[PDB]
């Protein structure tokens, strides 16, 4: 009924700013909690996020930023029917959390490859720094981290055992939170 934990958001810095907060006691955020987020221009438009229940008493939201730059600033208004519960601000550019890489498969030398989680025009594509974890599925003790940053999201290695692999990336120059590791592919 009362947000105990002030809301916190990270931005994928292309389309989605995911939020979360925590009230006191069980709340179906979707039934009642109303989040209202608007950017800071002159003919600003109103967007309403339908929240969800992350835990018993906590809530989660997902703002949709069609195109966001370094000078964007959102007014986050959490409603309760007609009782304002919290009012604040959000700058998507300081709290960036990139997308997860994907399309990860495997092809002497051994070839790993994945997709850039963003198109080239997106700013994160220019200082992305991939990190690929190769751990053996047969040998959990065997694990290795591979730093990548090439514009082509791929890796080559040529070290009997069976290994797995999963990649996560993050835009270096923007001081982002380590993205979620890509799905874990498997091979020998």
């Amino acid at each position, epitope marked *: 009924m009362k947000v105990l934990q002030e809301p916190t958001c990270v931005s994928d810095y292309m389309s989605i700013s995911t939020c979360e907060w925590k009230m006191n006691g069980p709340t179906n955020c979707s039934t009642e909690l109303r989040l209202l987020y608007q950017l*800071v*221009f*002159l*003919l*600003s*438009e109103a967007h309403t996020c339908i929240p969800e229940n992350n835990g018993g008493a906590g809530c989660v939201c997902h703002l949709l930023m*069609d*195109d966001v*730059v370094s*000078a964007d*600033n959102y007014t986050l208004d959490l409603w309760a029917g007609q009782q304002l519960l919290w009012k604040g601000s959000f700058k998507p550019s300081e709290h960036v959390k990139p997308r997860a890489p994907g399309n990860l498969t495997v092809h002497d030398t051994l070839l790993l490859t994945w997709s850039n989680p963003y198109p080239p025009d997106n700013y994160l594509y220019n200082h992305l720094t991939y990190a690929v974890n190769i751990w053996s599925e047969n040998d959990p003790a065997d694990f290795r981290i591979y730093n990548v940053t090439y514009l082509e999201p791929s890796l080559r290695i040529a070290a009997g055992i069976s290994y797995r692999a999963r990649v996560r990336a993050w835009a270096q120059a923007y001081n982002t939170t380590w993205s979620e590791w890509s799905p874990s592919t498997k091979w020998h």
Partner: nanobody, 115 residues
Framework: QVQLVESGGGLVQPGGSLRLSCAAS?????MAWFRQAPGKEREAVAA????????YYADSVKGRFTISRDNSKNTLYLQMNSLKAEDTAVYYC???????????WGQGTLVTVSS
């Protein structure tokens, strides 16, 4: 300091068209136009993002007026068609780097939709 000099205003027969032009010495995050009429305070007619890709118009002018800027040298445009008589006003082109494009204004140019 950035000067703003509008142009392209003048007398227009109603239902016609009118393309406004206001040059800025440099480029800006926020760029918007402001129409101000006799006894009527300057209202936000049209705005444009930093990296653009998002136009913002007033309900009175949506689908009617279009705001834009050329390449190389930057020049705020307020293209207007089907100009209604109640649009008669000195429109001002204003620029900004945060929130409302209220960093500069540089006066404006009068639009008079004739009878």
């Amino acid at each position: 300091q950035v000067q703003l000099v509008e142009s392209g205003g003048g007398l227009v027969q109603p239902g016609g068209s009118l393309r406004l032009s206001c040059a800025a010495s440099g480029d800006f995050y926020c760029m918007a136009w402001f129409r101000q009429a006799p006894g009527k305070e300057r209202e936000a007619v049209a705005a444009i993002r930093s990296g653009g890709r998002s136009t913002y118009y007033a309900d009175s002018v949506k689908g009617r007026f279009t705001i834009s800027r050329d390449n190389s040298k930057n020049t705020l445009y307020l293209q207007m068609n089907s100009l209604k008589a109640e649009d008669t006003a000195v429109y001002y082109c204003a620029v900004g780097v945060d929130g409302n494009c209220r960093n500069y204004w540089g006066q404006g140019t009068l639009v008079t939709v004739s009878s």
